[PDB]
Design a protein around this ligand. Structure first.
Ligand SMILES: COc1cc2c(cc1O)cc1c3c(cc(O)c(OC)c32)CCN1C
Length: 328
């Protein structure tokens, strides 16, 4: 069978936390007053939720309300517990309240308001400096939640809210997030297609925080090369083929051989043989102002097949790519 794997950092954070910290099934929800919040505008739908802009009439402040679709009590408590555990951390969206919505009869999560502008137009304007700045801010959020024993598992542009006016960033939608426990096998059906790590795509279940670093790498590639999304697969099989056309098939085989993983034989007719490519081939006159040797080296160290070989969030913050970013 497949070889087991462990996170190289924060391996035992939940082992030494009190049980109450990660045992979210036993969490008791403390309910606020639903009448404090009046819905103003619907912002959108998740697969598991409807999201609204609202006003907190106890202070006339804007908030965001996420009314959960009826999903398993356990998944609901998981997101709630994780949000409470991470509350106050760097660039973590703040859960301000939880109320019972009278119409859905489900929990409605109340968050701090974030004044974003849609990433597709935002990514279209970001400068080299902006990219490095906001990448560093995401890394603060990721190192924090990883250090707190939680993997996000759905890192993507849509879940990184940016108030560009106040240079403010928040990592949102912790509905797929999980507690990391050494040796635990996890559902590989997480993250959005373009951001799925190789471990998911080859059906390796014993993954860890490093999944988020692959996803972050996919974001970075899309930003510095101005190509959305970078790995544009038409399904989960083609997604791996797209990755292999850049990282090469020999290192893919080295990866799965290391963990004694067998590739799904569906790949026999579609994977082919591909050399590893140098990142310079994706540079052109319309993105070169966003590219530097530091950017390419940083990207190269995020986008590794082997989840154990990727930069940790902390290591990433040490990278020369961020030397030019003003620290606080
Ligand atoms: C914090 O301010 C906002 C949050 C969200 C949003 C728009 C916002 O302005 C739009 C999303 C959304 C989702 C899940 C989630 O956990 C969110 O944070 C509460 C949001 C899923 C989809 N819909 C559309």
């Amino acid at each position: 069978g497949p070889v087991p794997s462990r996170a190289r950092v924060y391996t035992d954070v939940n082992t030494h936390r009190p049980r109450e910290y990660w045992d979210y099934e036993s969490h008791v929800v403390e309910w606020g007053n639903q009448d404090d919040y009046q819905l103003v505008r619907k912002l959108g739908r998740g697969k598991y939720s409807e999201v609204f802009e609202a006003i907190n009439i106890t202070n006339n402040e804007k908030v965001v309300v996420k009314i959960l679709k009826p999903v398993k009590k356990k998944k609901i408590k998981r997101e709630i517990k994780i949000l409470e555990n991470l509350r106050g951390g760097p660039n973590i969206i703040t859960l301000a309240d939880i109320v019972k919505d009278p119409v859905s009869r489900t929990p409605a999560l109340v968050f701090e308001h974030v004044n974003n502008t849609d990433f597709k137009q935002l990514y279209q304007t970001l400068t080299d400096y902006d990219i490095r700045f906001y990448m560093y801010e995401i890394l603060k959020a990721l190192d924090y939640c990883h250090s707190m024993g939680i993997m996000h598992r759905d890192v993507k542009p849509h879940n990184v809210m940016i108030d560009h006016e106040h240079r403010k960033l928040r990592l949102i939608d912790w509905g797929l997030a999980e507690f990391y426990h050494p040796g635990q096998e996890y559902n590989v059906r997480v993250a959005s297609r373009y951001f799925k790590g190789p471990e998911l795509l080859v059906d390796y279940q014993m993954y860890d925080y490093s999944l988020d670093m692959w996803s972050l790498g996919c974001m970075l590639a899309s930003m510095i090369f101005r190509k959305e999304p970078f790995f544009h697969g038409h399904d989960n099989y083609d997604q791996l083929v797209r990755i292999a056309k850049v990282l090469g098939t020999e290192d893919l085989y080295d990866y799965i051989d290391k963990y004694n993983i067998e590739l799904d034989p569906r790949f026999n007719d579609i994977l082919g043989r591909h050399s590893r490519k140098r990142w310079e081939r994706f540079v052109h006159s319309e993105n070169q102002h966003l590219v530097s040797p530091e950017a390419l080296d940083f990207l190269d160290k995020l986008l590794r097949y082997d989840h154990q070989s990727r930069l940790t969030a902390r290591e990433a913050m040490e990278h020369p790519y961020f030397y030019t970013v003003v620290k606080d």
